[PDB]
Scaffold this active site. Structure first.
Site, PDB file in Angstrom:
ATOM      1  N   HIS A  67       0.837  -1.191   0.000  1.00 38.29           N
ATOM      2  CA  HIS A  67       0.000   0.000   0.000  1.00 38.29           C
ATOM      3  C   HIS A  67       0.889   1.265   0.000  1.00 38.29           C
ATOM      4  CE1 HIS A  67      -2.652   3.160   1.642  1.00 38.29           C
ATOM      5  NE2 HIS A  67      -1.704   3.352   2.569  1.00 38.29           N
ATOM      6  N   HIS A 115       5.130   6.709   5.698  1.00 37.16           N
ATOM      7  CA  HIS A 115       3.874   6.956   6.413  1.00 37.16           C
ATOM      8  C   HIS A 115       3.496   5.540   6.939  1.00 37.16           C
ATOM      9  CE1 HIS A 115       0.925   5.016   3.787  1.00 37.16           C
ATOM     10  NE2 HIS A 115      -0.048   5.418   4.607  1.00 37.16           N
ATOM     11  N   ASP A 116       2.817   5.472   8.122  1.00 34.09           N
ATOM     12  CA  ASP A 116       2.493   4.212   8.808  1.00 34.09           C
ATOM     13  C   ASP A 116       3.763   3.480   9.358  1.00 34.09           C
ATOM     14  OD1 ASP A 116       0.008   2.974   6.297  1.00 34.09           O
ATOM     15  OD2 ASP A 116      -0.434   4.170   8.092  1.00 34.09           O
ATOM     16  N   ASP A 266      -1.768   9.821   0.262  1.00 33.90           N
ATOM     17  CA  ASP A 266      -2.295   8.816   1.213  1.00 33.90           C
ATOM     18  C   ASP A 266      -3.807   8.993   1.373  1.00 33.90           C
ATOM     19  OD1 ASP A 266      -2.446   6.945   3.539  1.00 33.90           O
ATOM     20  OD2 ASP A 266      -2.482   8.830   4.680  1.00 33.90           O
ATOM     21  N   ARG A 440      14.103 -12.043  32.997  1.00 39.88           N
ATOM     22  CA  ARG A 440      13.822 -12.719  31.745  1.00 39.88           C
ATOM     23  C   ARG A 440      12.924 -11.890  30.816  1.00 39.88           C
ATOM     24  NH1 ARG A 440      15.811 -15.373  35.679  1.00 39.88           N
ATOM     25  NH2 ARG A 440      17.095 -17.202  35.162  1.00 39.88           N
TER      26      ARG A 440
HETATM   27 MN   LIG Z   1      -2.666   4.995   3.757  1.00 38.32          MN
END
Ligand SMILES: [Mn+2]
Ligand SMILES: [Mn+2]
Ligand SMILES: [Mn+2]
Lengths: 502, 246, 244
Positions: A67, A115-116, A266, A440
């Site tokens: 995308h 972006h993202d 976008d 841990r």
């Molecule tokens: Mn998008």
């Protein structure tokens, strides 16, 4: 005055280059940034981060990566369009662009790509599960006004101490910042403090989508409402963000002029792709979809952008030669049709409102609400909402994601449910007697976010009364970084592994 | 006839370069060896150490940059170092041999065998072969893949093990009496490769003696397209599904 | 009171020896590092190097034997160790025999102050490289949840009155508590038997009697769990969490 020489900052934060450099040398720095981004694991992670549909056994469906590549090509077109139009207006040399042509374009593409990038495993649902988990543990609403006699905050240090202290303002900011996690804000945090990429100021400018600080609590400036729609950066970045503003010649709450181009791309790639995938997942036919779009338009005119785009693409699909599939041809030309009308608009809009955009003060989007363009997008969105986003397999996964993150955050609650003296002890000695689970669990954390925590901590003054508050802010940040850093798969796999089912 | 497109050479070159270094980065990531261990394998591999050689300029250079993430910095600058020397070379080579390249007759690569550049690449390749490509988890999957495809091809043998008269019959009527397995198997084939087969077939002359031979050539092509078109996952998933283990 | 059996000290010693070296052999077997890599980690760990120390006599010695590999290395490393450590502890025992016979001797056969040092060296290397491995740690954390969760699954039997619990012990089938019934049946017949026996030996009249019952009730639960293998406990956890 509009001069892009002043906006296209080829300098860096650390090991920064300085002194003259040719058109070519400059291109090379921006080309360097591309290589940095493209080889980043943070960029590879996106092929395993879900985009609308679940990660199916066949790659027919788009992932966050596929995308973002699509978004980047849109961005490329818009940038290229702005440039071509401007060369025809001859204003290119006039706006200090004649030599920064390629860079300009690359920045867009690279910001589009990124972006993202700062988004968590299960996206907007991840954000929710994070913010919600922190809210039940911090309650930043209980900090807004005067010290509450019954403060719902689970942390001793962050609880507003009674009728005294300016430290009460530090507690307020920490509670709001940690409870208001946003992918974009995390993205900034990521490229600098986490991924330690050291990108050109200009690039980092392009990925700074919002001007709102995460710690913000009040009503948004009327004049800067839109630019502060969502948070753009964390308290942990405030320092570096100031450094960024100064380097890119930005006022407090002013946006980087190119960010607007990336944003636009976008806003377009946004739906159409998922709509293509919807017919691919057999949710409805391409014919069924066309009729849902006709239903959605309502106010039909024979010369509207619906006719010019959707009606146009529908006719191309029927008696489509090229031995091409009906669906393929349909989406192929629908995409074309959209860009062919929307890209010029946004390209123009940019140029038209360039002084305010250059200032980064322009309180609007390139494709703003009133535009026939914004309407067309909304049309796709409505159809997607009412038919695609509503599908059970989607919704199932959305709910699933929420629990995975919430549960994971709870698995790591022991590290937070601790004293500084104890936690710090664990940071120095890797093996701690009394806290073996915590040991841990702390080892499970990724070496980079771990490193980053220590570094932010070592920069603070030991003596300071704010020091313990900071430690906690950072402690939470560290945990947040680990989680947000994960892919949908890794986070789910870990959830099961730590729930003991493998 | 047998002449190459002048730009293909550029694309080719980029692949020859990117080719190894990335997998070598991933090798240290999969913990096969340390970044330090790798440097020593590269030192061992160079052998003919002298000069201000490209090894010193690239690998030795990148190793020093990494000391004061180590791995990230190492690969980051190793990549840089490589491109910074190799790209100019191939860019030059292209221009230098442009007439033969424009002709698409030039019987060589931009980074050809004798070049210190070609040597550096080969070095990466050798290390990758001897240490990375040789790892059992790799090899396991390589062998696994072979069986998946072979088995899948055998699952589809019935469509090929048929007469034209019968096969054609299946293409017209979707439901054929006597061949039900073959029916269902033909349905499994993707609509695009299916379409393509029919099209190539409809373009042939019915009368032609070569017509049946062509049909078969295309029939096989059709099958090949289906398989080649699949992802590692889909092909494996299908193998299991058609072997009945899901 | 608080005196140890004189032989316990011998058994303890062997355990302290075997303790690491075996896991270190397994570490190279699980490919965590090479036998060569390990030798270098041991050289790094010794620091205060002398050409006549037990390091040279054991580890350096075994390293040379291996070259003109892994099998030979560990084989002789084991040999080397026992061949020096066993005599020491054997002597130590005899040397401090009166206090050992008394079972009052407040020390180990292989103390703290050269044998104890060699062991510690193996331990340090194991800690810093083997015990620290993620697959180990993952399983360690996994184990914790399995047991914790299992203990919670059996909480209903403890979250009960004596009058009710005892009722379940007599009648195998109880009306109102069917989950608790079935859960009590899941318990192994031996630990179950043992509980009843300890209970029947108590005086009914006693005010301490209910406290004892609970002590025993918990003991009974503890016995069941502790009795399980890593596999059975994990398997049961999933089965009772309903995922099989
Ligand atoms: Mn998008
Ligand atoms: Mn390739
Ligand atoms: Mn033992």
């Amino acid at each position: 005055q509009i001069d892009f020489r002043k906006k296209i900052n080829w300098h860096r934060r650390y090991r920064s280059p300085q002194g003259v450099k040719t058109e070519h040398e400059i291109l090379r720095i921006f080309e360097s940034d591309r290589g940095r981004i493209i080889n980043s694991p943070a960029i590879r992670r996106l092929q395993q981060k879900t985009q609308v549909f679940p990660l199916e056994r066949n790659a027919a469906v788009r992932t966050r990566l596929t995308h973002s590549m699509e978004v980047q090509q849109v961005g490329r077109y818009i940038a290229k369009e702005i440039l071509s139009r401007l060369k025809e207006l001859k204003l290119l040399e006039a706006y200090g662009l004649d030599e920064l042509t390629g860079p300009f374009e690359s920045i867009v593409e690279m910001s589009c790509l990124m972006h993202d990038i700062g988004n968590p495993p299960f996206g907007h649902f991840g954000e929710a599960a994070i913010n919600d988990w922190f809210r039940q543990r911090l309650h930043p609403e209980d900090a807004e006004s005067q010290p509450l006699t019954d403060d719902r905050c689970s942390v001793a240090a962050l609880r507003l101490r009674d009728g005294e202290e300016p430290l009460n303002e530090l507690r307020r900011k920490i509670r709001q910042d940690l409870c208001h996690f946003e992918g974009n804000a995390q993205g900034i945090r990521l490229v600098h403090t986490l991924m330690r990429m050291n990108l050109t100021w200009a690039q980092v400018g392009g990925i700074l989508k919002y001007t709102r600080p995460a710690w913000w609590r009040g009503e948004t400036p009327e004049t800067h409402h839109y630019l502060m729609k969502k948070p753009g950066y964390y308290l942990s970045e405030e320092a570096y963000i100031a450094r960024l503003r100064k380097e890119l010649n930005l006022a407090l709450y002013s946006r980087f002029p190119l960010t607007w181009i990336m944003e636009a791309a976008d806003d377009i790639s946004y739906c159409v792709a998922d709509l293509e995938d919807a017919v691919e997942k057999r949710i409805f036919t391409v014919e069924q979809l066309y009729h849902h779009l006709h239903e959605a338009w309502g106010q039909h005119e024979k010369g509207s952008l619906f006719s010019l785009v959707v009606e146009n693409a529908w006719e191309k699909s029927r008696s489509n030669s090229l031995s091409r599939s009906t669906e393929d041809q349909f989406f192929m030309y629908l995409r074309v049709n959209t860009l062919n009308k929307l890209v010029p608009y946004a390209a123009q809009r940019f140029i038209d409102n360039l002084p305010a955009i250059f200032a980064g003060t322009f309180n609007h989007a390139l494709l703003e609400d009133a535009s026939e363009c914004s309407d067309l997008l909304k049309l796709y969105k409505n159809v997607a909402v009412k038919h695609v986003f509503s599908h059970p397999d989607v919704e199932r996964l959305e709910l699933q994601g929420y629990r995975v993150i919430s549960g994971l955050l709870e698995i790591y609650r022991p590290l937070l449910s601790l004293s500084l003296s104890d936690f710090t002890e664990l940071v120095e000695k890797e093996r701690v007697k009394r806290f073996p689970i915590e040991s841990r669990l702390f080892h499970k954390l990724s070496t980079r976010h771990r490193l980053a925590y220590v570094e932010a901590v070592s920069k603070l003054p030991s003596d300071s009364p704010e020091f313990p508050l900071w430690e906690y802010y950072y402690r939470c940040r560290l945990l947040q970084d680990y989680i947000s850093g994960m892919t949908d798969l890794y986070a789910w796999d870990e959830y099961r592994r730590l729930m003991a089912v493998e």
